[PDB]
Amino acid sequence: ATVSEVISYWRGLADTDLAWGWQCADVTNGTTTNFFGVTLWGNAIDLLDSAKAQGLEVIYDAPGINPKAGDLFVMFTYGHPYGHTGIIIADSDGYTIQTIEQNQFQVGGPARYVTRAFSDGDGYIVGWIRPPYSDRKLKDEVGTFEVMVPALNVRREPSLNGEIVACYQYGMTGTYDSVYVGDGYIWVSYVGASGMRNYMAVGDADGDYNVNPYCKFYLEH
């Protein structure tokens, strides 16, 4: 994947919803998962450590060390211990950064253009990941899931663009009663508080198998 491809995609979303076709729903792991097939587990603030463990290039902020277009930044947030992320869409001079950022629905909000200093009233930049840019119901099952990705959408149908009804954050647990396969993903299903059924992608699918999990799974004993 190319820098121009990725930046163009997020510019598209910022320019403009519940039909969003991404399952992993944050900027950083959404980008690595959907464009590079690399999934990162943890909160926003953990993703530099997760990226390093997956062999990606990680650069920590410092004097003279400034991010480039296409870099995925990680940020410490004063308001909460989970941190914040976004995509850098232009080379930085070290004083401002041009970014696209997001703003039941815990995370994965809509994309918007932002320009921020390296430190302000919301937090400060810690570092950034530099991606390697180039040139059917399966079974009934009584279990619980644990969201391992930073952000994961929840829909009304086990389809790519199913209506989004929630967005779960890393660490979230919950029961499920059934597992589905569809549109390249494995899904679990459960009855929401609304009273109606919900579907959530829990990993990329090769045939009937979760070959890239977004969650851990626990079965009743």
Query: 215 forms bridges with which residues in the sheet?
Result: 147
Q: How many CB atoms lie within 10 A of CB 3?
A: 15
Experimental determination technique: X-ray
Residue 105 in tokens:
């629905």
CA dihedral for 18, 20, 24, 28, sign (positive or negative): negative
Q: What is the residue type of 53?
A: A
Residue 27 in tokens:
């900027």
Question: Which of 147, 129, 173 shows the shortest CA–CA distance to 27?
Answer: 129
Q: How many CB atoms lie within 10 A of CB 86?
A: 26
CA distance 214 to 78: 27
The CA angle 30-35-36, to the nearest 5 degrees, is 100
In Å, what resolution does this model reach?
2.6
H or E element, residue 27: helix 27-36
